[PDB]
């Protein structure tokens, strides 16, 4: 037989893509432009205008969906306890840092910080392309064209407070917040729990919290290390707005 | 939408119009929003769950402001209302080592 | 546009089920969401997409051992509750699957099932009974009470 | 012509099925860690609320049967004409749509 | 091509999680792999599939 | 659904000194006082007679 002696606790990043951006045509402006005679001229191929405008808001729609879908599912908003003692556990590298005025945690920052979005995230165009806030090359030559970008339902802030609230509600409580009543544990029992849940006794946990607490921690440091350094990490997020940025251009 | 809105006034060629459709074009409610603007809607500073989603975290209801026409119409005068929707209702477990 | 959101929605939809059965849960789905066997999952929030740290044991350090399906004593056969037999060249212990914390071979962890004639590999070792022990530490009291007066 | 050829897909299997065989479970989440085959059908009867002596007091019998079982499934396949039919659906819709 | 590019990455993704869950460990979810209570898969190559 | 701490609930691994917030209390054992219970019939032997 071989029977392991000794463990290491790993964290491990994986990217998942839930939203493009909410695009809007007008067909009419696309195809026609301001002239009269070639809307009247398109008003002889029927439905095609208003079945494209149907299917580009059902996508938009969906957007939305996706976004309620992956990060709404839980019932409340929980904070994490102000004295943030957890048996050893840091965990001050993925809650929200209250100094920043975004209220998101470093790794989010870092996160936020590596996809670029293309320029694509603007819809107002007035005041000259909104003083260039705006990307004019890109933005505003497409949008004179009848190519508008629809802002998300759920801000940036509104959706990093739902993963503060996921984050608070699996520290403070464990599986207990997803299937009824948030009941209070304490983390080194739930952790515990948890090695009970893999086929580990609960004294591996209990004789060895120290260690296991210091691999969390440098496995959690190493993840941002890994994220600032490692390029092209968050590629899937950028292929997807490359790909909608190109299929626009 | 992707209007600030000084431009909606008359942007609209508000001269050759219906004075019904001009309603809209202004008053004294007039609210900017990461979407356009919205016309015919208060701007409340207190929060609710999404109703109809306007965008940018901006949703819009149908509410009995019970303001001053609230307490002097009978019907409490019912107007649409603009917020910022509100993710859920807070909570905070009773965290404790021991407990 | 449209086959591009299908694809995003599949995307959306694997993303909500690791938020269900990763965060919200410990699964045992193996590979489903980490590299080992699964912790628990920690989402952060990223432009369009979300991020999942799945905190994962991992063993290491693997020493071989022999080891023996079953235990033949008093002509029976005993097998481990929850662990497996394991020798370190001279003595047999048991000990638990995933982290070596090896213990003696008592009948509280172990039970009986048939003589030893059927199973394959079967060795030969003592099953400690705690009792007998405890029954025989009075049993030289009874024997002192008879012998010394 | 596809990145990974035949040679290497069969390599992959053959990789995973020696794990499988020679470590059980053990390979997928960290090292692999050898374990006789009889103690992990052992396991895999426990894992089904089987007790592990049903397995070991009936070994020969079970050996048998997954003998003789493996054997059919190459009967089935040698015999039986249209078994890989979803495959060759996709051939043949590749096919009709380049015709 | 591209519709039905997406119905085989279902399969390729199905495949990759049948691949896991029932090649590299014993599955507790019902139907997912075999008819009955599983104990152990084998995987083998197809000339486009598995 | 409360139970007293038996030694058939628990199992035992290693010295009250290693865990981090242990406490003290008993865990009662069903054999000693049964067998306590025939210790004392031979006290009553060995001093009554």
Known sequence: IAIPTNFTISVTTEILPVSMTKTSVDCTMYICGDSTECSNLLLQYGSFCTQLNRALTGIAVEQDKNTQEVFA???????????????????SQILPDPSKPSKRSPIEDL????????????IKQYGDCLGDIAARDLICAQKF???????????????????????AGTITSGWTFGAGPALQIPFPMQMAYRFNGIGVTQNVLYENQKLIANQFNSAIGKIQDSLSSTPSALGKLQDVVNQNAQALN | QDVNCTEVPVAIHADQLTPTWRVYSTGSNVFQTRAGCLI???????????????????????????????????????????YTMSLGAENSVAYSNNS | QLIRAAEIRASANLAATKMSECVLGQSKRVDFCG???????????????????????????????????????????????????????????????????????????????????????????????????????????????????
Request: proline share 7%.
């Open chain 1, 73 to 91: 599912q839980v019932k409340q908003i929980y904070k994490t306890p102000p004295i943030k003692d957890f048996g050893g556990f840091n965990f």
């Open chain 1, 111 to 122: 996160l936020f910080n590596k996809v670029t979005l293309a320029d694509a995230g603007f």
């Open chain 1, 145 to 167: 064209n009848g190519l508008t970008v629809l802002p998300p339902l759920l801000t940036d802030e509104m959706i990093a407070q739902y993963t503060s609230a996921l984050l």
């Open chain 2, 40 to 82: 015919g809607a208060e701007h409340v500073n207190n929060s609710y769950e999404c109703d109809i989603p306007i965008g940018a975290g901006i949703c819009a209801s149908y509410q009995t402001q019970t303001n001053s026409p609230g307490s002097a119409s009978s019907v409490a005068s019912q107007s649409i209302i603009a």
């Open chain 3, 35 to 149: 590299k080992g066997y699964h912790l628990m999952s920690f989402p952060q929030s990223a432009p369009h997409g979300v991020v999942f740290l799945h905190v994962t044991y991992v063993p290491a350090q693997e020493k071989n051992f022999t080891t023996a399906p079953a235990i033949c004593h008093d002509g029976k056969a005993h097998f481990p509750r929850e662990g497996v037999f394991v020798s370190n060249g001279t003595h047999w212990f048991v000990t638990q699957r995933n982290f070596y914390e090896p213990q003696i071979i008592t009948t509280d962890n172990t039970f009986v099932s048939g003589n030893c004639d059927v199973v394959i590999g079967i060795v030969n070792n003592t099953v400690y009974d705690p009792l007998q022990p405890e029954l025989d530490s009075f049993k030289e009291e009874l024997d002192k009470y008879f012998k010394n007066h």
